[PDB]
Amino acid sequence: KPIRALDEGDIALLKTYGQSTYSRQIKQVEDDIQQLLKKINELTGIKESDTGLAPPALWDLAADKQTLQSEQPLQVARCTKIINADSEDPKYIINVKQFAKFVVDLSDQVAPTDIEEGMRVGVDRNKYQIHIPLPPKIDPTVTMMQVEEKPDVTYSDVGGCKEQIEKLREVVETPLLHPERFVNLGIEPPKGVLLFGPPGTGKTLCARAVANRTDACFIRVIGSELVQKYVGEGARMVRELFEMARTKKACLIFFDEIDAIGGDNEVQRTMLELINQLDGFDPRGNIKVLMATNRPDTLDPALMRPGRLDRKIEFSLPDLEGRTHIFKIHARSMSVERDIRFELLARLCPNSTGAEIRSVCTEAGMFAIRARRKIATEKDFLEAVNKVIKS
């Protein structure tokens, strides 16, 4: 049926007649409400942003003028090849970030022995002379580095990797704590090991546990960290980490998620720096390298060559005894009853990674909280494993 467009009279009658007698004042009042909100928002002000002004009597404004008129700023740059200086070619090509690159000669206050490739250097504006080397410094607060000297996870907190942890024992415990046997067997201790396995299997955690029990400090090197913002000088950063490992009596250098690094210009500079710090560094040292990746083959072929990485270790998904053991180790830190059939739960979660099991325990706690009970029951674990497992 040809449906008629509502006429002006029709609009006018729809606006009235079938209306509440309070439409007018209600709508008007709500409009003034919104208008008053906008007025308050526009006139409430912003408040002074509090620039970083130190408390008075701390200021040396006279000496501030002295510095501002005498002391000069220096641009910083990534120094590159020495052009084979030999004191007749003191110039180096230097890279001032996104700005250009320049060949520049030193200042008289610095000596060439204090300048080498790859370091940050402060250069003047007028002639771009490197006025002072600026080491990138090393500090646990910056980057994300070892940040650990004695990890809190022992062999107790790792379960279901019995053959796995036994092979790791072979790798690290026998050379570090029993050097004499490989001394009188005339065999070089293992030079490198790769702990390759699916994510959440426990690679990181097993490495941390063995670090705690090997009386050596654990090193945490997140790959995406130096793929992201902390890239470039990362070569000198790991250079310093390895040097402090030399100063340290024994470091357990493990590069977390090396899938992010092993798979390359500064990346190649980095792993050739580890070529200098495993091949160049003596194979006898107590700072053994630990490799763990989600993608095994991703590691560059020049890395696992014999005389750089002796072993490769497969972290498989936990078995039935393994799954019940991780369930126990995760529910120890939880408020549950003492008659939880952990074997039942381990059976109910086949081919489940360790992270899935920790999430199952967390969900069981969540279900217990849902009923506002301080103690989780077996029923909560059953529904939690019904939730997480089976996706």
Partner 1 sequence: TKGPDAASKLPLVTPHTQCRLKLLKLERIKDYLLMEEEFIRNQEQMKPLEEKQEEERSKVDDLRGTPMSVGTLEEIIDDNHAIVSTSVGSEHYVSILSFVDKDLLEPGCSVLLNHKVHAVIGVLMDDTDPLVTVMKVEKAPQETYADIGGLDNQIQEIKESVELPLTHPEYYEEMGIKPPKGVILYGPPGTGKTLLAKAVANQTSATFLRVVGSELIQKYLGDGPKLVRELFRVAEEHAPSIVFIDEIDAIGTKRYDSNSGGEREIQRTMLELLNQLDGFDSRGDVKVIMATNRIETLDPALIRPGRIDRKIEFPLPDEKTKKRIFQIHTSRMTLADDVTLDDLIMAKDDLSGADIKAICTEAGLMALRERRMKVTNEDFKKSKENVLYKTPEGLYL
Partner 2 sequence: LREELQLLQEQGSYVGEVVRAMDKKKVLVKVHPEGKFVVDVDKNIDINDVTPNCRVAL
Partner 3 sequence: LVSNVIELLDVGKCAVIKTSTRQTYFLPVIGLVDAEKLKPGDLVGVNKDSYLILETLPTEYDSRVKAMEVDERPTEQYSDIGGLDKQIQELVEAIVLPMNHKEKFENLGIQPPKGVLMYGPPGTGKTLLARACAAQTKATFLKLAGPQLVQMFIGDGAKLVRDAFALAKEKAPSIIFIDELDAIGDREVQRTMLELLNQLDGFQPNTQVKVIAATNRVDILDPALLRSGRLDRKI
Ligand X SMILES: Nc1ncnc2c1ncn2[C@@H]1O[C@H](COP(=O)(O)OP(=O)(O)O)[C@@H](O)[C@H]1O
**Residues flagged as binding site for ATP:** 197-204
At which residue do the structure tokens 């001394």 appear? 183
Q: Which residues contact 162 (CB under 8 A, 6 or more apart)?
A: 322
Instruction: Based on the shown chain and the rule CB under 8 A, indicate whether residue 348 belongs to the binding site for partner 1.
Output: no
Among 129, 143, 146, 204, binds ligand X (CB under 6 A): 204
Q: Tell me how far CA of residue 360 lies from CA of 57, 96, 355, 364, in angstroms.
A: 59, 51, 8, 6
The least distance separating ligand X from the CB of residue 203, rounded to whole angstroms, comes to: 3
| Minimum CB distance to partner 2, residue 30 (Å) | 25
C-alpha dihedral sign at 343, 344, 347, 351: negative
DSSP state, residue 259: G
- The dihedral built from the CA positions of residue 26, 31, 36 and 41, taken in this order, carries a sign that is positive
Q: Does 81 bind partner 3 (CB under 8 A)?
A: yes
Nearest approach, Cβ of 79 to partner 3 (angstroms)?
13
- Residues 285-304 within binding reach of partner 3 (CB under 8 A): 301-302
- Is residue 388 a contact residue for ligand X (CB under 6 A)? no
Q: Are 261 and 226 in contact (CB under 8 A)?
A: yes
320 binding ligand X? (CB under 6 A): no
DSSP symbol at 155: G
Nearest to residue 316, comparing CAs of 158, 192, 195? Answer: 195
Asked if 85 is part of the footprint of partner 3 (rule: CB under 8 A), the reply reads no
**Is residue 126 within the footprint of partner 3 (CB under 8 A)?**
no
DSSP string of 262-283, one letter each residue: ----HHHHHHHHHIIIIIIS-T
What phi and psi values does residue 281 have, to the nearest 5 degrees? -65, 145
By CB under 8 A, tell whether 95 contacts partner 1: no
Among 79, 376, 385, 389, binds partner 1 (CB under 8 A): 376
Phi-psi region of 56 (alpha: psi -120 to 50; beta: other; left: phi over 0): beta
The strand pair at 311-314 and 192-196 is best described as parallel
**Contact residue for ligand X among 171, 354, 359, 368 (CB under 6 A):** 354
Q: Does 387 bind ligand X (CB under 6 A)?
A: no
CA distances from 308 to 21, 112, 257, 345 (A): 88, 34, 19, 42
Side-chain-side CA neighbours of 359 within 13 Å: the count stands at 12
102 binding partner (options partner 3, partner 2, partner 1, none; Cβ < 5 to 8 Å by kind): partner 3
Please report, as ranges, the residues that interact with partner 2 according to CB under 8 A: 42-43, 46, 48-49, 51
Please list every residue from 264 through 323 that binds partner 1, using CB under 8 A: none
Region of 372 please: left (phi>0), alpha (psi -120 to 50) or beta: left
Query: And the tokens for 298?
Result: 């991703």
Regarding 44 and contact with partner 1 (CB under 8 A), the answer is yes
Residue span 248-277 as binding mask against partner 3, x where in contact by CB under 8 A, dash where not: ----------------xx--x---x--x--
What is the footprint of partner 1 within residues 211-270 (CB under 8 A)? 222, 224-225, 227-229, 260
**CB of 82 or CB of 176, closer to partner 3:** 82
CB of 256 to ligand X, least distance (A): 7
Which residues fall in the annotated binding site?
A: 197-204
Q: What would the x/- binding string for partner 1 be over residues 116 to 135, using CB under 8 A?
A: ------x---------x-x-
Select 158 or 241, whichever has its Cβ closest to ligand X: 158
Q: Taking CB under 8 A as the rule, does residue 98 contact partner 1? A: yes
205 binds ligand X per the rule CB under 6 A: yes
Q: Left, alpha or beta for 102 (phi > 0: left; psi -120 to 50: alpha)? A: beta
Among 2, 3, 113, 185, binds partner 1 (CB under 8 A): 3
Residues forming the site for ligand X (CB under 6 A): 158-161, 199-205, 318, 326, 329, 354-355, 358
Positions touching partner 3 (CB under 8 A) are 80-81, 83, 93, 99-103, 264-265, 268, 272, 275, 301-302
